[PDB]
PDB file of C-alpha atoms (C1' of nucleotides) in Angstrom:
ATOM      1  CA  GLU Y 964      84.311  70.545  26.479  1.00 50.47           C
ATOM      2  CA  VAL Y 965      83.843  74.048  24.809  1.00 47.86           C
ATOM      3  CA  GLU Y 966      85.215  77.670  25.148  1.00 50.63           C
ATOM      4  CA  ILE Y 967      83.063  80.501  23.615  1.00 50.85           C
ATOM      5  CA  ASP Y 968      83.540  84.298  22.865  1.00 54.53           C
ATOM      6  CA  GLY Y 969      80.606  85.325  25.168  1.00 52.16           C
ATOM      7  CA  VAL Y 970      79.411  82.363  27.368  1.00 51.88           C
ATOM      8  CA  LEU Y 971      81.515  83.336  30.452  1.00 53.50           C
ATOM      9  CA  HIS Y 972      78.280  82.159  32.203  1.00 53.23           C
ATOM     10  CA  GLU Y 973      75.013  80.669  30.768  1.00 54.14           C
ATOM     11  CA  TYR Y 974      72.917  83.703  31.937  1.00 52.60           C
ATOM     12  CA  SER Y 975      74.580  85.897  29.196  1.00 55.74           C
ATOM     13  CA  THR Y 976      73.571  87.572  25.873  1.00 54.19           C
ATOM     14  CA  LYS Y 977      74.952  88.583  22.400  1.00 54.46           C
ATOM     15  CA  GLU Y 978      72.806  91.183  20.488  1.00 51.80           C
ATOM     16  CA  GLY Y 979      73.254  89.867  16.874  1.00 51.71           C
ATOM     17  CA  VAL Y 980      72.786  86.102  17.583  1.00 50.83           C
ATOM     18  CA  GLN Y 981      69.164  84.643  17.522  1.00 53.75           C
ATOM     19  CA  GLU Y 982      69.684  82.056  20.314  1.00 55.10           C
ATOM     20  CA  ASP Y 983      70.777  85.221  22.259  1.00 52.88           C
ATOM     21  CA  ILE Y 984      73.328  82.816  23.817  1.00 51.94           C
ATOM     22  CA  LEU Y 985      71.499  80.131  25.873  1.00 52.81           C
ATOM     23  CA  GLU Y 986      69.798  78.313  22.901  1.00 49.53           C
ATOM     24  CA  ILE Y 987      73.344  77.607  21.500  1.00 48.19           C
ATOM     25  CA  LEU Y 988      73.342  74.810  24.203  1.00 45.41           C
ATOM     26  CA  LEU Y 989      71.510  72.586  21.681  1.00 44.52           C
ATOM     27  CA  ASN Y 990      74.084  70.816  19.416  1.00 44.37           C
ATOM     28  CA  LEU Y 991      77.205  70.668  21.680  1.00 41.42           C
ATOM     29  CA  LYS Y 992      76.480  67.540  23.294  1.00 41.57           C
ATOM     30  CA  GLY Y 993      75.122  66.864  19.763  1.00 40.92           C
ATOM     31  CA  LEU Y 994      77.920  67.272  17.189  1.00 43.00           C
ATOM     32  CA  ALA Y 995      79.832  63.973  16.661  1.00 42.57           C
ATOM     33  CA  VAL Y 996      82.676  62.920  14.274  1.00 41.66           C
ATOM     34  CA  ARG Y 997      85.360  60.208  13.723  1.00 40.41           C
ATOM     35  CA  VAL Y 998      89.128  60.612  14.537  1.00 39.17           C
ATOM     36  CA  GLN Y 999      92.252  58.678  13.296  1.00 38.82           C
ATOM     37  CA  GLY Y1000      94.282  59.046  16.483  1.00 37.52           C
ATOM     38  CA  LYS Y1001      94.765  59.672  20.240  1.00 38.64           C
ATOM     39  CA  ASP Y1002      91.977  60.535  22.762  1.00 39.82           C
ATOM     40  CA  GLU Y1003      92.142  64.355  22.730  1.00 38.76           C
ATOM     41  CA  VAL Y1004      91.535  66.605  19.677  1.00 35.33           C
ATOM     42  CA  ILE Y1005      90.379  70.181  19.034  1.00 34.52           C
ATOM     43  CA  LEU Y1006      88.271  72.287  16.635  1.00 33.02           C
ATOM     44  CA  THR Y1007      87.269  75.947  16.423  1.00 33.67           C
ATOM     45  CA  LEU Y1008      83.995  77.373  15.003  1.00 33.27           C
ATOM     46  CA  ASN Y1009      84.277  80.895  13.702  1.00 29.69           C
ATOM     47  CA  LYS Y1010      81.137  82.237  11.852  1.00 29.63           C
ATOM     48  CA  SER Y1011      81.335  85.850  10.623  1.00 30.33           C
ATOM     49  CA  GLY Y1012      78.490  87.922   9.078  1.00 28.27           C
ATOM     50  CA  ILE Y1013      74.794  86.929   8.543  1.00 28.75           C
ATOM     51  CA  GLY Y1014      73.925  83.168   8.462  1.00 32.23           C
ATOM     52  CA  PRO Y1015      73.592  79.826  10.285  1.00 33.09           C
TER      53      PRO Y1015
ATOM     54  C1'  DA J   6      76.958  60.688 -10.459  1.00 31.62           C
ATOM     55  C1'  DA J   7      81.430  61.104 -10.208  1.00 34.81           C
ATOM     56  C1'  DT J   8      85.775  61.887  -6.803  1.00 33.32           C
ATOM     57  C1'  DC J   9      88.456  60.031  -2.461  1.00 32.12           C
ATOM     58  C1'  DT J  10      90.746  59.873   2.405  1.00 32.96           C
ATOM     59  C1'  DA J  11      90.655  58.061   6.332  1.00 33.29           C
ATOM     60  C1'  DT J  12      87.429  55.283   9.070  1.00 32.23           C
ATOM     61  C1'  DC J  13      86.403  50.827  11.635  1.00 32.86           C
ATOM     62  C1'  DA J  14      88.051  47.215  10.647  1.00 28.04           C
ATOM     63  C1'  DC J  15      88.214  42.407   6.364  1.00 29.22           C
ATOM     64  C1'  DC J  16      91.203  40.880   4.469  1.00 28.44           C
ATOM     65  C1'  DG J  17      96.240  39.748   4.187  1.00 26.95           C
ATOM     66  C1'  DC J  18      97.578  35.344   3.688  1.00 30.07           C
ATOM     67  C1'  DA J  19     100.178  32.320   8.541  1.00 32.09           C
ATOM     68  C1'  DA J  20      98.731  28.711  10.919  1.00 29.99           C
ATOM     69  C1'  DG J  21      96.196  24.402  12.316  1.00 26.70           C
ATOM     70  C1'  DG J  22      92.018  21.942  13.318  1.00 26.32           C
ATOM     71  C1'  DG J  23      88.317  18.384  11.709  1.00 27.75           C
ATOM     72  C1'  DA J  24      87.246  15.725   8.496  1.00 25.94           C
ATOM     73  C1'  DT J  25      86.229  11.889   5.562  1.00 24.81           C
ATOM     74  C1'  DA J  26      87.677   8.377   2.930  1.00 21.76           C
ATOM     75  C1'  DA J  27      90.767   4.951   2.167  1.00 17.57           C
ATOM     76  C1'  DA J  28      91.879   0.229   3.767  1.00 12.30           C
ATOM     77  C1'  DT J  29      91.149  -2.963   6.736  1.00 12.44           C
ATOM     78  C1'  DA J  30      88.318  -5.974   9.568  1.00 12.73           C
ATOM     79  C1'  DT J  31      84.514  -6.950  11.665  1.00 11.77           C
ATOM     80  C1'  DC J  32      79.598  -7.584  11.689  1.00 10.18           C
ATOM     81  C1'  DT J  33      75.046  -9.427   9.804  1.00  8.92           C
ATOM     82  C1'  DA J  34      71.943 -10.882   6.521  1.00  8.10           C
ATOM     83  C1'  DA J  35      70.447 -13.195   2.356  1.00  9.50           C
ATOM     84  C1'  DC J  36      70.126 -17.144   0.655  1.00  8.23           C
ATOM     85  C1'  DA J  37      70.134 -22.236  -0.595  1.00  7.93           C
ATOM     86  C1'  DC J  38      69.846 -26.030   1.081  1.00  9.85           C
ATOM     87  C1'  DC J  39      67.239 -29.414   3.975  1.00 10.21           C
ATOM     88  C1'  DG J  40      63.347 -31.115   6.868  1.00 12.86           C
ATOM     89  C1'  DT J  41      59.075 -30.739   8.800  1.00 16.48           C
ATOM     90  C1'  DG J  42      54.119 -30.712   8.836  1.00 17.58           C
ATOM     91  C1'  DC J  43      50.261 -28.792   7.094  1.00 15.70           C
ATOM     92  C1'  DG J  44      46.040 -27.768   4.545  1.00 16.69           C
ATOM     93  C1'  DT J  45      48.129 -30.711  -1.542  1.00 17.79           C
ATOM     94  C1'  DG J  46      44.253 -34.063  -3.590  1.00 18.35           C
ATOM     95  C1'  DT J  47      40.261 -37.587  -4.084  1.00 21.64           C
ATOM     96  C1'  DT J  48      37.612 -40.660  -2.081  1.00 22.78           C
ATOM     97  C1'  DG J  49      34.380 -42.364   1.246  1.00 22.17           C
ATOM     98  C1'  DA J  50      31.329 -42.654   5.423  1.00 20.44           C
ATOM     99  C1'  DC J  51      29.644 -40.002   8.326  1.00 19.57           C
ATOM    100  C1'  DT J  52      25.800 -36.991  10.544  1.00 18.96           C
ATOM    101  C1'  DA J  53      23.049 -33.780  10.858  1.00 24.37           C
ATOM    102  C1'  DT J  54      23.713 -28.165   5.545  1.00 21.79           C
ATOM    103  C1'  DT J  55      19.357 -27.634   3.848  1.00 21.68           C
ATOM    104  C1'  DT J  56      14.775 -28.583   2.266  1.00 22.18           C
ATOM    105  C1'  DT J  57       9.954 -30.467   2.910  1.00 27.27           C
ATOM    106  C1'  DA J  58       6.997 -33.070   5.448  1.00 31.38           C
ATOM    107  C1'  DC J  59       4.747 -34.114   9.631  1.00 30.79           C
ATOM    108  C1'  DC J  60       3.528 -33.761  14.742  1.00 31.80           C
ATOM    109  C1'  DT J  61       2.722 -30.962  17.990  1.00 34.32           C
ATOM    110  C1'  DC J  62       6.751 -25.658  20.718  1.00 39.15           C
ATOM    111  C1'  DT J  63       6.297 -20.589  21.589  1.00 37.97           C
ATOM    112  C1'  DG J  64       4.005 -16.789  21.816  1.00 37.87           C
ATOM    113  C1'  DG J  65       0.542 -14.180  18.983  1.00 36.92           C
ATOM    114  C1'  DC J  66      -3.678 -11.353  21.451  1.00 35.90           C
ATOM    115  C1'  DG J  67      -8.250 -11.500  22.527  1.00 34.48           C
ATOM    116  C1'  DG J  68     -11.050 -11.639  26.033  1.00 35.27           C
ATOM    117  C1'  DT J  69     -12.882  -9.957  30.483  1.00 36.24           C
ATOM    118  C1'  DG J  70     -13.318 -11.953  36.484  1.00 35.00           C
ATOM    119  C1'  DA J  71     -18.499 -10.962  41.109  1.00 37.08           C
ATOM    120  C1'  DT J  72     -19.732 -12.798  49.446  1.00 39.83           C
ATOM    121  C1'  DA J  73     -18.807  -7.490  48.548  1.00 38.89           C
ATOM    122  C1'  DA J  74     -16.227  -3.276  47.808  1.00 40.54           C
ATOM    123  C1'  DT J  75     -20.927   3.142  45.447  1.00 40.79           C
ATOM    124  C1'  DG J  76     -18.721  12.002  48.876  1.00 38.96           C
ATOM    125  C1'  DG J  77     -13.001  12.154  45.844  1.00 39.93           C
ATOM    126  C1'  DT J  78      -8.430  14.131  46.119  1.00 40.76           C
ATOM    127  C1'  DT J  79      -4.772  17.844  45.704  1.00 37.69           C
ATOM    128  C1'  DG J  80      -0.977  20.922  47.994  1.00 36.50           C
ATOM    129  C1'  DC J  81       1.607  24.998  47.380  1.00 34.97           C
ATOM    130  C1'  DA J  82       1.305  29.509  41.019  1.00 34.30           C
ATOM    131  C1'  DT J  83       2.610  33.742  45.030  1.00 35.33           C
ATOM    132  C1'  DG J  84       4.134  37.081  48.592  1.00 34.79           C
ATOM    133  C1'  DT J  85       8.072  41.862  45.046  1.00 34.66           C
ATOM    134  C1'  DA J  86       7.712  46.365  41.586  1.00 34.39           C
ATOM    135  C1'  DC J  87       5.886  48.379  38.712  1.00 34.23           C
ATOM    136  C1'  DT J  88       1.186  50.114  36.413  1.00 34.34           C
ATOM    137  C1'  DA J  89      -2.263  49.625  32.477  1.00 35.36           C
ATOM    138  C1'  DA J  90      -6.640  47.872  31.806  1.00 34.21           C
ATOM    139  C1'  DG J  91     -11.340  46.215  32.843  1.00 34.52           C
ATOM    140  C1'  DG J  92     -14.467  45.888  36.076  1.00 31.57           C
ATOM    141  C1'  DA J  93     -18.024  47.478  39.670  1.00 30.04           C
ATOM    142  C1'  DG J  94     -22.081  51.010  41.226  1.00 29.77           C
ATOM    143  C1'  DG J  95     -23.735  54.993  43.368  1.00 29.04           C
ATOM    144  C1'  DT J  96     -24.141  59.587  42.162  1.00 30.27           C
ATOM    145  C1'  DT J  97     -23.439  64.455  41.021  1.00 28.58           C
ATOM    146  C1'  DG J  98     -23.273  65.896  37.447  1.00 28.47           C
ATOM    147  C1'  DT J  99     -22.943  65.955  31.286  1.00 24.62           C
TER     148       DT J  99
END
DNA sequence: AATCTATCACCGCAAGGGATAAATATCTAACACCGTGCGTGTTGACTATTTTACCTCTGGCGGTGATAATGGTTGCATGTACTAAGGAGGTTGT
């Protein structure tokens, strides 16, 4: 599951992104990992300024 | 290209299963003996191994019959689709 600073619905937009917003739905269902422990964990993802 | 933390797990290291090999006991087989009978030997009489001789098989092949017999057989090449060539001959032209 995921919670994002603009995707309150998929038909939305973010002037400064290049996906606008909808082509972010590409690597979430796509990122995978391993985990030591119990069956619920959390990350955040927090890019600031120009880049990937 | 070295570092490790933090995976999914192999090792960390207790248990226990099968194995095989020892000892025993059974099996069979290898042999040495014996007895049988056959293929151990020379000799001898047989009869039919081979040869040649003779008397007389089998099959080599050469030879050709006569009351007369004197107009014959032969069946389906192909039925389509083409069209290129040669053949015909009268004539209206070259």
